[PDB]
Amino acid sequence: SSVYTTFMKSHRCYDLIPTSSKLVVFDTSLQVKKAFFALVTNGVRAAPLWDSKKQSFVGMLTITDFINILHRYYKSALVQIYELEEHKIETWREVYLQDSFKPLVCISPNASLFDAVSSLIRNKIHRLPVIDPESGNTLYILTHKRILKFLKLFITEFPKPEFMSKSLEELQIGTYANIAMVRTTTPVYVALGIFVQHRVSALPVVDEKGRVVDIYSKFDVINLAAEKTYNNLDVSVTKALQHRSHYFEGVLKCYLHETLEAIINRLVEAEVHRLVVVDEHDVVKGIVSLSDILQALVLT
């Protein structure tokens, strides 16, 4: 128990929703190719899935879905199987588990922010629909990014716990072993395979000396839905990153010996999902993600 735990347990999910927001919903009989293009066109990262037959929300369509489908699409094409691209949402969902069956994870606007964080961690998820039980409507999609920002802003800097002044290395927040990375020349299809195997939301791009020069993330993946690519998956990650060659400073990094406070501050101010942990010479040592931060704040 701390000033963070107290705050989270005494605030409702309702308090986090902006005055005005946009929500994209897909009927499950919609074509997959059309759904992912709708994500891009609407500037949105996820969409609740509506099953008309059941008159119910049954899941979410995210970039992780897109990664998995593209990976399967690429391998099937080399073996002359072409289905997915004319798959509807229900058929794609039927493919991947199907009893193995995963129900929709959601939360009430009146439930605590504590329960929201707990649900994200437990379910290994980044998108938590806030659903009003009276009307059944989805109001908002809650995220790590939004939650951390809220915490940073509405908690007074003081009554400050001792652990805020402690370094990442002291507190062991982040991942510092078996880091999923790609090289400058690594083809996109290989990168997708790495995404699927490690269930990770970003890949650092490194040179021959293991120094980070860029980052390949979920933002870069849905761009393949914008451009009518689907074909040129054999190109390098670098070529795929040309869509943002201009207007790009560099990768946001941190060091092992920075305080939790400084890193929370950097993550919030930058509006980014992770920092690449690096040494004196920009060699990748690990990743600290919003996932690690919120897991640390909820348990300590």
Partner: protein, 68 residues
């Protein structure tokens, strides 16, 4: 007694009411329009329906993508 007569206004509803200038036909994306249905032009057999609804103090604009 004498037969009685009927006076009917008739033309009060001969034409539908004109759209009041506060309700606008087109929104670019790119008040109280609350609860009103909006739509994109149908493209490639898909319809996009849209509306804005209030929950307490919050407004959400929902878009439904739905095949014909």
């Amino acid at each position: 007694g004498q037969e009685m007569y009927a006076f009917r206004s008739e033309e009060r509803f001969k034409s539908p009411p004109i759209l009041p200038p506060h309700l606008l036909q087109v929104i670019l994306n790119k008040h109280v329009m609350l609860n009103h249905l909006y739509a994109l032009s149908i493209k490639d057999s898909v319809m996009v329906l849209s509306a804005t609804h209030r929950y307490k103090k919050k407004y959400v604009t929902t878009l439904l993508y739905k095949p014909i």
